Amino acid sequence: YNLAQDLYLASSCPIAALEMRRDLQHWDSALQLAKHLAPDQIPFISKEYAIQLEFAGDYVNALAHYEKGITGDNKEHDEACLAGVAQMSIRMGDIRRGVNQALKHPSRVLKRDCGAILENMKQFSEAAQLYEKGLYYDKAASVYIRSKNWAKVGDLLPHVSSPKIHLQYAKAKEADGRYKEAVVAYENAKQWQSVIRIYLDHLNNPEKAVNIVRETQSLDGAKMVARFFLQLGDYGSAIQFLVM
Amino acid sequence: RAMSSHFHQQVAAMQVLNVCFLSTGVAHSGVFATKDAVAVWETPVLAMHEENVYTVESNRVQVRTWVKQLLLFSEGNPCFLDICGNFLVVGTDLAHFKSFDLSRREAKAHCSCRSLAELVGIASLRCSSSGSTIILPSNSPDSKICFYDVEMDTVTVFDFKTGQIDRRLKNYVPVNHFWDQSEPRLFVCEAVQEDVLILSFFISEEHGFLLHESFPRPATSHSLLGMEVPYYYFTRKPQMVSRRPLRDFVGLEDCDKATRDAMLHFSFFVTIGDMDEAFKSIKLI
């Protein structure tokens, strides 16, 4: 390939050398050649170089070539380069600038991957903001639980589609002892297992307990509520109120 | 004779009794071979664990010098020992087995007694380095193969005839099996046509079981001795050890530990189908 390039430059179609250097993934040599033959390809090739630098873990040069691969015409290429710059700056520890470019990029996928990157740096708040920006309420609730900021967890719960986070937040409330947000979370967690337990223990509403049994086929607390509430002469009707 | 042959810690022993330390490349009823100690075997199965001896008494296991530790079975006479990593599986022919931890000074029962019959005779048992995966039900061997999930406490049975895995190659029956000495998720199986073919699989918890490699047994080889990175080691038909580099592992035999681990990840993600992750693993190579 060295001799092939040396012969190509002396030919009447010099750009062919660039092509083979581009075809050989020799992006450094391709950038060296493109300064003479095809400068319009200077951005694209540079971006590709950074991509390889990104995949080789050499983020420092990846940032430089991403910011050096910006154009003024190809909107998609510019957006991809900006997303790369954002990811690199985030991985540079320049978290303020990185999240700044993260905010100003119209692509939810960038927020999706940037949340994982922040989880790699374990900055729970930034990951939560990034996830909640585009569409990811569940991941935002997960990282908020990691940060134990249950206010935002409860804010996201109406949009949270993950019952596991509902279960975790309900356990947190059980630790807090409110036993009412816990009930709603357990119901959203498909966890009437704990809803009937709370109605047996905390709210002490046998009528709502048996209504839960009738409307959801609650089993674990089905006999237990009757056992606790069978302390009356006519409470047999209660032990039959659970359909035995 | 049966020619009881074993392989462990890059040491291959065949009863003749050829011993090959392939790490150093030095060649000299049952035999068990490690780097330092080789033990020949009143026990159905016995082995060395450094200087420990796994004597198998009636419904009992003991360790003594060249009496140190005792373990009681409540479960048939144990007759299947396999030490890999820091975990030993002790199994019987009565559909029961246990896994004992060896990361500490003495063997402690990592898993309680379990009933294979309740979940599903036993041909043989083998264990991984991590010990979280624990087998062929049966006195001819059966096509189905059972693996006991210790952590999530279940069993997975793969049928050779149907190619289906039940959670609780169609004309081949397993007769021997082994494990890789470094990756707990890499398993191997020798299947004889009811000729002989070697099937390597990867056990991924989040995906299930994967078909990693499927190759006919080499002509010079007659039994599956096992593997150790990066070679499948077999007992050669009369150096009586035949080492075949793995199909993906052609060319990186002399690489360092990091590179071989990365391309191990490559092969595992190829079995998964995770092209991107295998690509990332190869990236540095």
PDB file of C-alpha atoms in Angstrom, chain B residues 4-9 11-15 17-19 21 29-41 45-50 52-54 81-84 88 126 178 181:
ATOM      1  CA  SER B   4      -9.501 -43.520  32.875  1.00  0.00           C
ATOM      2  CA  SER B   5      -8.157 -40.175  31.652  1.00  0.00           C
ATOM      3  CA  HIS B   6      -8.461 -36.729  33.208  1.00  0.00           C
ATOM      4  CA  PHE B   7      -7.461 -33.148  32.454  1.00  0.00           C
ATOM      5  CA  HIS B   8      -7.177 -30.265  34.912  1.00  0.00           C
ATOM      6  CA  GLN B   9      -4.998 -27.146  35.309  1.00  0.00           C
ATOM      7  CA  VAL B  11      -2.315 -31.297  33.198  1.00  0.00           C
ATOM      8  CA  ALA B  12      -3.517 -34.286  31.170  1.00  0.00           C
ATOM      9  CA  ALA B  13      -3.220 -37.812  32.581  1.00  0.00           C
ATOM     10  CA  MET B  14      -4.017 -41.059  30.762  1.00  0.00           C
ATOM     11  CA  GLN B  15      -3.834 -44.523  32.290  1.00  0.00           C
ATOM     12  CA  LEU B  17       0.289 -43.571  32.708  1.00  0.00           C
ATOM     13  CA  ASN B  18       1.196 -40.628  30.483  1.00  0.00           C
ATOM     14  CA  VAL B  19       1.225 -37.223  32.202  1.00  0.00           C
ATOM     15  CA  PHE B  21       2.046 -30.622  31.668  1.00  0.00           C
ATOM     16  CA  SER B  29      -8.592 -47.758  38.026  1.00  0.00           C
ATOM     17  CA  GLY B  30      -8.612 -43.971  37.802  1.00  0.00           C
ATOM     18  CA  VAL B  31      -6.147 -41.090  37.799  1.00  0.00           C
ATOM     19  CA  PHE B  32      -6.551 -37.412  38.709  1.00  0.00           C
ATOM     20  CA  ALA B  33      -3.851 -34.913  37.760  1.00  0.00           C
ATOM     21  CA  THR B  34      -3.049 -31.385  38.928  1.00  0.00           C
ATOM     22  CA  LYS B  35       0.040 -29.204  38.550  1.00  0.00           C
ATOM     23  CA  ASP B  36       1.732 -30.498  41.717  1.00  0.00           C
ATOM     24  CA  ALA B  37      -0.003 -33.723  42.807  1.00  0.00           C
ATOM     25  CA  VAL B  38      -1.323 -36.757  40.915  1.00  0.00           C
ATOM     26  CA  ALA B  39      -3.607 -39.226  42.708  1.00  0.00           C
ATOM     27  CA  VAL B  40      -4.575 -42.731  41.567  1.00  0.00           C
ATOM     28  CA  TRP B  41      -7.563 -44.602  42.991  1.00  0.00           C
ATOM     29  CA  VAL B  45     -13.635 -41.323  43.033  1.00  0.00           C
ATOM     30  CA  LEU B  46     -10.841 -39.389  44.739  1.00  0.00           C
ATOM     31  CA  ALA B  47      -8.683 -36.401  43.866  1.00  0.00           C
ATOM     32  CA  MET B  48      -6.092 -33.938  45.154  1.00  0.00           C
ATOM     33  CA  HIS B  49      -6.977 -30.342  46.058  1.00  0.00           C
ATOM     34  CA  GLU B  50      -3.472 -28.933  46.600  1.00  0.00           C
ATOM     35  CA  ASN B  52      -6.093 -32.018  50.362  1.00  0.00           C
ATOM     36  CA  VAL B  53      -7.430 -35.496  49.582  1.00  0.00           C
ATOM     37  CA  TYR B  54     -11.149 -35.956  48.891  1.00  0.00           C
ATOM     38  CA  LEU B  81     -16.202 -35.798  42.180  1.00  0.00           C
ATOM     39  CA  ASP B  82     -15.222 -32.839  39.990  1.00  0.00           C
ATOM     40  CA  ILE B  83     -13.053 -29.976  41.267  1.00  0.00           C
ATOM     41  CA  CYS B  84     -13.043 -26.792  39.193  1.00  0.00           C
ATOM     42  CA  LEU B  88     -16.449 -29.179  44.145  1.00  0.00           C
ATOM     43  CA  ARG B 126     -19.037 -31.877  36.088  1.00  0.00           C
ATOM     44  CA  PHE B 178     -16.179 -31.337  30.848  1.00  0.00           C
ATOM     45  CA  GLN B 181     -10.849 -24.193  33.442  1.00  0.00           C
TER      46      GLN B 181
END
